With several copies, the nearest count.
Chain A
């Protein structure tokens, strides 16, 4: 078949067809199951040994694999591969954290506390200390993973008009904006069915954006405003340090009814 009616190759009369001089040869590790009648599985389905492929049940699959339905060659290919569940990111970790029975892990770790070499007992304790923290507190470990990210009230990250009619704004607004853009773009990329490379890039960028918002500079390059080297001031920076909330506004304050002069 071709772009325009001419240049098509139409069979002049009865004959048999042979393919020669291919551009390249693709060697696939797969099984070939030819079919005469209609095929019941469509392309992309995943399949296990014994699953019925075509012709009302006559032809079935031997290996584990992914269905490739060839309408030219009239064959159902099954490419050897598994239906394995393997993930990346905070979603994987959130699942493994949900799938924790802390009672059981305590039991196991207590049994591990009954062991020589000193080093084994030391590590089971540290683990057992985190377990017991969650058990006593009532906190679920999967809460260490965020689904909804809180947004600080606006008067604590103000956008104010200064004297000159100019605007002055808190760095948190920019950290949130990066996050929001990336979240929104991620939702859009999902609805439009982007490939896994793209969705993965977006997802890891989302993690970094959350990371800068909560503690900027902790992991990776500090997020900066454009054309300045100044790390944006994240939530962690606000709380901690000499300039932090505690040692600046809490354990000490500026006061009314006070003055100063030379003695």
Chain B
């Protein structure tokens, strides 16, 4: 909303449009650097004011929320590599 200085909602149907165009990098920007990828949005802003190109995005924070919310439901959600080894998307912060 305008009163909160809000961003526009790029909703399910808007994502579909970008998919049908095959605009993979525009869509990925929408899903990460222009929203909840915190490292990405911070890093992209820093690049633009320095004249560099925007960096490759990282994990959207709302995916981390989904993972933690599924754990609260006692479901173990694991990101895996091609070797089926776990990949830690919390970068060591949530493991003892």
The interface of chain A, by Cβ under 8 A from chain B, is 143, 146, 149-153, 156, 214, 235-236, 238-239, 245-247, 249-260
Is B8 in contact with A146, judged by CB distance below 8 angstroms? no
Q: A150-B71, A150-B72, A249-B36 are in contact. Are A256 and B14 (CB under 8 A)?
A: no
Is B69 in contact with A245, judged by CB distance below 8 angstroms? yes
B42 to chain A, nearest CB (A): 11
Q: A245 contacts which chain B residues (CB < 8 A)?
A: 62, 65-66, 69
**A interface, by DSSP: helix, strand, loop or mixed?**
mixed
Is B69 in contact with A253, judged by CB distance below 8 angstroms? no
Q: Which of A152, A239, A250, A253 has the most CB of B within 10 A?
A: A253
List 16 extra interface pairs beyond A146-B74, A252-B12, CB under 8 A. Answer: A151-B72, A152-B68, A156-B68, A239-B73, A252-B9, A253-B9, A253-B31, A253-B35, A254-B6, A254-B7, A254-B35, A255-B9, A255-B34, A255-B35, A256-B34, A256-B41
Q: Which of B34, B69, B72 contacts A257 (CB 8 A)?
A: B34
Is B8 in contact with A250, judged by CB distance below 8 angstroms? no
Q: Which of A235, A247, A259 contacts B8 (CB 8 A)?
A: A259
Closest chain B residue to A238, Cβ basis: B69
Is B66 in contact with A250, judged by CB distance below 8 angstroms? yes
B11 at the interface (CB under 8 A from A): yes
